[PDB]
Amino acid sequence: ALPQTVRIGTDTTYAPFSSKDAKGEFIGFDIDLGNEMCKRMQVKCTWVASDFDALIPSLKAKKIDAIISSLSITDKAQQEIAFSDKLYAADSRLIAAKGSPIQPTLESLKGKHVGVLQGSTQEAYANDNWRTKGVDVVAYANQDLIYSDLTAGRLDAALQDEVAASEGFLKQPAGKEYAFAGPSVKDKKYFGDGTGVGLRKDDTELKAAFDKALTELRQDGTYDKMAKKYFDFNVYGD
Ligand SMILES: N[C@@H](Cc1c[nH]c[nH+]1)C(=O)O
């Protein structure tokens, strides 16, 4: 009943969770989690690269069978799809040039150019709260474009998952002159409760299989071993 091949869509521009190494192989914590779960589910899995905003449509169209792409578990998303249990926690946070006075507030951001990933919870938040009120919110096909436009000085700030910005950019050579601008942006309704495997609502069996795999690799400590490759903190949360 489970497919012998589970097709998993991911947006490979979100290090350290999902990206590509120099020879084009998919790498990162999402990939590690996905591969470990598939192993324990005893299914073959095929990774499929996609822009983030195409993931849920591809899933609904059955071009893929699952999404592992730091996809936040939100009220809004669950109207369209189902989710596995939580894979890890994910807060949102602004980044900007080091020394910048920028804060995640309308007062600070009005007339500023702020980059967000198209289709993301950050785009939802920024469009509702900031774009309406005169912040130049700029939506991008992928997160790599955002970092590029930031370093080029075309953007004043960018909003994205906190850990991705930190491990994927700030702690990298390209992000040396950048820092977080203000604390995490906390908003329960927009940003959801951690990330999970996104699935078609009727695929209850595939969800059960992922959930079971996830519980097992967390219990035996495999989760923590894989996570320590990327993180010196508790990425899972509570
Ligand atoms: N986790 C957020 C932001 C994100 C973009 N890509 C991966 N994560 C979301 O689900 O929209």
Curated annotation (Swiss-Prot):
Residues bound to L-ornithine: 11, 69-70, 72, 77, 121, 161
Binding site for L-arginine: 11, 69-70, 72, 77, 121, 161
Transmembrane region(s): none
Impact reported for residue 11 to A: Decreases arginine and histidine binding affinity
Known outcome of mutating residue 161 to A: Shows a drastic decrease in arginine and histidine binding affinity
Effect the entry attributes to changing residue 69 to A: Has no effect on the arginine and histidine binding affinity
Keyword vocabulary terms for this entry: Amino-acid transport, Disulfide bond, Periplasm, Signal, Transport
Biological process annotations from GO: amino acid transport
GO CC aspect terms: outer membrane-bounded periplasmic space
General remark: The 30-fold reduced affinity of the protein for histidine is primarily due to unavailability of one ionic interaction of the histidine side chain with the protein which is present in the other three complexes.
Function: Part of the ABC transporter complex HisPMQ-ArgT involved in lysine/arginine/ornithine transport. Binds lysine, arginine and ornithine. Can also bind histidine, with much lower affinity. Stimulates ATPase activity of HisP.
Protein name: Lysine/arginine/ornithine-binding periplasmic protein
Biological source species: Salmonella typhimurium (strain LT2 / SGSC1412 / ATCC 700720)
Gene of this entry: argT
